[PDB]
Amino acid sequence: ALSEIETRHSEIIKL
Amino acid sequence: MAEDADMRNELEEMQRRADQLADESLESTRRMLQLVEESKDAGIRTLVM
Amino acid sequence: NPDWNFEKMGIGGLDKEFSDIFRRAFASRVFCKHVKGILLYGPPGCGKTLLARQIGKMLNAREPKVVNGPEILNKYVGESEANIRKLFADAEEEQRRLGANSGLHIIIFDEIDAICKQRGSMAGSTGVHDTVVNQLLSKIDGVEQLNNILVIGMTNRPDLIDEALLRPGRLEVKMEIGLPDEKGRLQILHIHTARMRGHQLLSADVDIKELAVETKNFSGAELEGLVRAAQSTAMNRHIIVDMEKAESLQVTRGDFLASLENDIKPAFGTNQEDYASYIMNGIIKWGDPVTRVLDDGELLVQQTKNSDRTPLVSVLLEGPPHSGKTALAAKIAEESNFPFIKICSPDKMIGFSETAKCQAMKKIFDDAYKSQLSCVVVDDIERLLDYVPIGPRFSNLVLQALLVLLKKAPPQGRKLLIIGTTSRKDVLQEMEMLNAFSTTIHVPNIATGEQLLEALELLGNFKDKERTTIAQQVKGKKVWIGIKKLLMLIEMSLQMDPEYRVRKFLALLREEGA
Amino acid sequence: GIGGLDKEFSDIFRRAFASRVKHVKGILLYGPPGCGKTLLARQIGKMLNAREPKVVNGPEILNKYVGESEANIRKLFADAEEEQRRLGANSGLHIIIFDEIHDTVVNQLLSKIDGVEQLNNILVIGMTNRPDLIDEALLRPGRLEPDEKGRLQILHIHTARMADVDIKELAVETKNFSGAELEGLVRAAQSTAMNRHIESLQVTRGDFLASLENDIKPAFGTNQEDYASYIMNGIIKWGDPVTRVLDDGELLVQQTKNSDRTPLVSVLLEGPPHSGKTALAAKIAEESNFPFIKICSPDKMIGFSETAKCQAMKKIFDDAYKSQLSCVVVDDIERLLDYVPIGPRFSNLVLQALLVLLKKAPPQGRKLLIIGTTSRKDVLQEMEMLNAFSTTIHVPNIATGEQLLEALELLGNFKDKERTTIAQQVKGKKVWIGIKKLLMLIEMSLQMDPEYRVRKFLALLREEGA
Amino acid sequence: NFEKMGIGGLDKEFSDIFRRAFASRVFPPEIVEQMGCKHVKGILLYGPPGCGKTLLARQIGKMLNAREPKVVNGPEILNKYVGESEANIRKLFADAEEEQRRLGANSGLHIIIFDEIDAICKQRGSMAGSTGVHDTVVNQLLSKIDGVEQLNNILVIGMTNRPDLIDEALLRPGRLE
Amino acid sequence: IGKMLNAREPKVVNGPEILNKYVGESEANIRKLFADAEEEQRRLGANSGLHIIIFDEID
Amino acid sequence: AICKQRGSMAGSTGVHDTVVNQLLSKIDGVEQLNNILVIGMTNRPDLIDEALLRPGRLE
Amino acid sequence: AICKQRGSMAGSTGVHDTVVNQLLSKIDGVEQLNNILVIGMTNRPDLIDEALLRPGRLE
Amino acid sequence: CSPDKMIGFSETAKCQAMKKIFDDAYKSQLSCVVVDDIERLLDYVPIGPRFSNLVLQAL
Ligand SMILES: Nc1ncnc2c1ncn2[C@@H]1O[C@H](COP(=O)(O)OP(=O)(O)OP(=O)(O)O)[C@@H](O)[C@H]1O
Ligand SMILES: Nc1ncnc2c1ncn2[C@@H]1O[C@H](COP(=O)(O)OP(=O)(O)OP(=O)(O)O)[C@@H](O)[C@H]1O
Ligand SMILES: Nc1ncnc2c1ncn2[C@@H]1O[C@H](COP(=O)(O)OP(=O)(O)OP(=O)(O)O)[C@@H](O)[C@H]1O
Ligand SMILES: Nc1ncnc2c1ncn2[C@@H]1O[C@H](COP(=O)(O)OP(=O)(O)O)[C@@H](O)[C@H]1O
Known about the structure:
This is part of a larger assembly, with one copy of chain A, one copy of chain B and seven copies of chain C.
Chain A lengths: L1 H13 L1
Chain B lengths: L23 H11 L2 H12 L1
Chain C lengths: L14 H12 L13 E2 L6 H12 L5 E3 L11 H20 L7 E5 L1 H4 L18 H9 L7 E5 L4 H7 L9 E2 L5 H16 L10 H7 L6 H16 L19 H9 L23 H19 L9 E3 L7 H11 L3 E5 L9 H6 L1 H10 L3 E5 L2 H4 L11 H12 L9 E6 L3 H5 L18 H11 L4 H11 L8 H12 L7 H8 L5
Parallel strand pairs in C: 1-5, 2-3, 3-4, 6-9, 7-8, 8-9
The site of one adenosine-5'-triphosphate (ATP) has 18 residues of chain C, from helix 12 and helix 20.
């Protein structure tokens, strides 16, 4: 889930 | 028989590593351990003052 | 689909097959289900690459995708299957999205050998995705039939893949390019020599038309490679210390000397036939009997050439030892100059199980059956089937794997012959195989001094003085001698001195003839 | 609705259905390919139930089995058990058929059919052309205790879909192909005449031109026949002995047909060498037309171990048994035995096999006429194989010039004029000749110049001692 | 500088090799411009051990060409992951194909040296003991060398004790003369 | 000699140690041996501290 | 069963004779490893290779 | 099949002679277990090795 | 040891059963052994007289 790995990175940097 | 076969086989690497950088996400969640404590540590003692 | 015009000469391999596939492949799609794929094999490749590049040069008006080998594969599970859907999605999208059924998009997948195992059973225990045929297979025909695009294949060794996946409907079509025929190879060098021969400098006295035939079984790049070396040789002469200097000289001519030199040394065909070990010195006529043998031999050959009533001619020639039996068979064989002839000899079946020794002989007769006609030679029968009289012992399997094959007829409409030779007829009688041989020849040994002197004249070993010295005493033995030994013992006596031949020669000869 | 195949059909239904009408888990049928398998599977299922839902399973039965394609193999069975558990009061039957049949699926399939939970009252039938590929467990008692009119339908689906080919040639010439793979050339039928570098040439008539087999010849048809080659030249009746031998042999093939207490009949015919008796036996075998014919010839198994050679004769000979009745031939048995005179030596296992064959009876009813060819009998007299044989036959060589001239007259080698010259002596020399060597000699004589044809012919006919 | 240094033997063989495979290198460019003749892709030399081949195979390409040789030791390419094998060969030709694309006529002539090739390359249709398709790196090789993309201005030399076990499909001329 | 006569610690393979289930890593262990003396020669040139290898039951 | 003679006897190179080489290389190898005793038991002793039974590996 | 009676000499040890060794070593081996019962079944009582069925192993 | 039970073995497989029991007999202080019906044990025929020589030699 590279969509969700990249979001696990990116959205949580936004967090 | 009178048979000896000694053999080898090969690997299929698992996914989820588009680029190594992904572990930087851990460097993020380090930081939101870093950027959380001083908020309360000054919050409650800011209530003290 | 085909946007532009083309010229066929480029492959120069054959135009029959290019037309045939052109007929079958493109007829549906230019001007029924259309052709979705092809594959093809030649054993050394011999121009596969040129063929694929050239039709790709012609048809697409775009670049098709190329694969180097397994490179689809990758460690990441499924991404190996992502790599194929990468290119197939374009064609699929275009077909249903664009809807014009424009099929310029085609691919060269080379070496199907590597990517696919027939069911995956080959190479035993493998990863589930170590071999994926199922994905690209299902991709092309599985969900629904796709007629808008063409896949191509190259395999130098098709047999690995052939059984499972080539069942009709995935690919029913399969093609093979064979090595050039004599004129085929003629136009091969012609195209390669086009660029040279289009320049006046090169190839005086070229004589390509005998160069082709000087190549019996050669194919492809070696012919090209002859030219590589042939230039390299003419390029060598001027290359001259540390610095090897070639001063500017535009005078260089590839002469036949370059091709002639670089004919033998640098390049070797896959299959070749030679008579050299069998023929040291040729044959010299030592009288009428040699010509008699060749006379009724050529009679026999014309018989088997014209006549269809007796597809086989069972013949042998027998004589005493060292009488020039084997070479003679070779020469008559050449004078027939049938398209296929093989020399069987125990020399090449040496130290083999007799079963292996017959299973090497069944092979060649089947290979000869494949031709419309052929002439096979079998020499030293007694040595092939290992007869020894001390007490009779031999290999029986060889006997009958020789014998019945004499009696059979190859498939109707093609005819053949055999010929055999041996040092004795007697055991052959008692062993009941000469009955099977229809005709028989007696090759004699030298019986008389006069014709001996005549044979010596052909050799011209002895000068007239000593020939006359011989002529007095030599007559009256009425010798039982065979010639091969003759050749030997002359040389045995020459080495004593040129002065003293006689004390060695004649006293050595009296041992023979009882 | 299946033409023929009624006794096998007759027995099969009662045993499975009688129990339905411990219950059988499944019945498995093995048939040769082209047996109309699909119709039979449909027919049997339809007969079993009025409206039991027909379920069709795709050909690729096995998969990797590690979490993908195991549940689905499990699921199709799983659906059937759901009804089965729900309805316990009375018998409930669901039919699932898998047409044309890794690790886990073998074990998994066996477990579903037979379990700790019985799972009975359901049946699954597999029909396959080949037995060996399928799993061993099914065979043991317990868990599983061309059709050229059809090819005309292959035409009237594929060919009718699109100045023509004949109606019937491409239905009776099936021996080399089958219609299920025949889809390349018919599609090429356009391509055939289309490739003339051809805006449009006038439209076609569906034209058929060498679209019959040759565009894509590779195919599977198991023709398995090469009878004609042994007789390259048809046998000519040159003499009373010929008609004698032939009529005396065919009275045997005839009396067998009505025979009792001789299902086998053994005859050995023998003549000297280079007298054709190999085509002759093939001729008489042709003469009496049988369901099945087969030919044991040294030519095929040349250079094989003895235990392979005998095995080959069994392998053909049990096929001949499985026919209702057939004759077979075995030639050149001096070679089949690997005989040589110089010292006696031969293959013994083949000998003993053959000899026991000649008196081994076929199982209940069926009968055969075996013939064998012999250059030399006396060898066989010493090998004590002859008594097992019966009614042996001497075929002679040519004794006389009358028979000779009449023979080549039947052939027509010589013009009558030149034939005069050799005719000048009819008795003057006397002959031992067999037909094969003679026919071989006439060719070389003719090859030589017309002056010397008969001149050399006579010389060589005398060279072999008249 | 070659200056006839280091080999010490087999002047015949050296002459034949030099004229055969460096003629394309040594000539002045115009002459072949009249021809259509490419560079040879590669060569192969073998013989009994201790016979002097690795000496020359150093000197050729070490001294003779202006370039740094690329060595591969025999199995060193091989690794377990299915695509890393081939993905290590393309590492070898990437420089020479990309500068080929850029500069067509001439290039720095990146040379590879195989060594003890018999282990790494043998005939495709032998799986005995391997029970793997991974004998088929060779397919990548010969589909890489001439491939669909023909590449000139690359040279490659093979070395083996055993000449007879190689698939001759990559021994045909143009790949190895 | 290897360990007491001269100054190095020798890397020793005991019989087969090398062999491995995966292709190429067995062979790779070979160069894991040589690559501590290889660079050493590379960056001291000719003069160098000696490296030693003891095979055993090499047959 | 483990070790029978390794001299290209008992079929093709014994039965994976690499093993016994490793073993007798291991116990008497370049390190002494003086601190262990191995028990072994057979009903057919003669099979075993003389390389292993000699004094100091097993006396 | 597996328990055919092995015989002792350098050659012709056998094809399956190494399965039985583990079997019997499980039965009567080191660290005995009393937690077990095992039933052999055959139609060939004379081919079974005589030690496989000696008392204590199969009594 | 009788032929009764050793029917069908090939020559060497007879020899090894002999040598087996005799090597069992070399492990007891006093051993009385029997060989019955020798002439069938080493197969004897007057006709074209033939027998198994290695059996004899072993014996
Ligand atoms: N017809 C001939 N006239 C003259 N010389 C001949 C003739 N045939 C062969 N020779 C010479 O004899 C030599 C070969 O003899 P050949 O090979 O037939 O012996 P061979 O067949 O081995 O005899 P054997 O089969 O008894 O061993 C050749 O060197 C050839 O020059
Ligand atoms: N009426 C006839 N009588 C005999 N032979 C004939 C007759 N008509 C034709 N033939 C020919 O006789 C040939 C006999 O070949 P066949 O295989 O019988 O050899 P053969 O006689 O069995 O040889 P052998 O008996 O020595 O084994 C055939 O090629 C056939 O054309
Ligand atoms: N012809 C030669 N001239 C000079 N030195 C040589 C020669 N042959 C061998 N040597 C010596 O041997 C070395 C070369 O080894 P060599 O070429 O024999 O290996 P090789 O033949 O490749 O062995 P293998 O073929 O088994 O790999 C040189 O460095 C030198 O020490
Ligand atoms: N006219 C020609 N016909 C056939 N082959 C040719 C011709 N001209 C050159 N060749 C050579 O044939 C080679 C292509 O062979 P290919 O089919 O790739 O062999 P492989 O399948 O073994 O790789 C090219 O490298 C080229 O040099």
